[PDB]
Homo-oligomer: A and B are copies of this chain.
């Protein structure tokens, strides 16, 4: 009963995983201050911009741009030769 099964995975540098990490980095920052917060964060990542949006019900104050840039910088995007720079990318917040 031989049969081939295939599964795949992507690294943390994948664009669909950068958005996931940015969204959860925002979530973790909020949970440190207000554990009972309500967070629904959606992140859209383009060639040179990061759009962070969603609805938050909390009493916590977070700097979305600082969190986003630190998250991307830790991944390893540091200059434009890689195709994306954490220090020189637009971080729009629609939260």
List residues of A whose CB falls within 8 A of some B CB: 42, 44, 46-49, 51, 53, 61, 64-65, 79-81, 83-85, 87-95
Instruction: Give the number of times this chain occurs in the complex, counting copies.
Output: 3
**Judging by beta carbons under 8 Å apart, are A94 and B92 in contact?**
yes
Query: In the complex, given contacts A48-B88, A48-B89, A49-B94, what are 6 additional A-B residue pairs having Cβ atoms less than 8 angstroms apart?
Result: A47-B94, A48-B48, A79-B79, A79-B80, A80-B80, A90-B94
Q: Distance (Å) between the CB of A23 and the closest chain B CB?
A: 13
Q: How far is the CA of A47 from the CA of B92 in the complex (A)?
A: 11
Specify which of B42, B53, B83, B91 is in contact with A88 (CB 8 Å cutoff). Answer: B83
Q: How far is the CA of A65 from the CA of B56 in the complex (A)?
A: 12
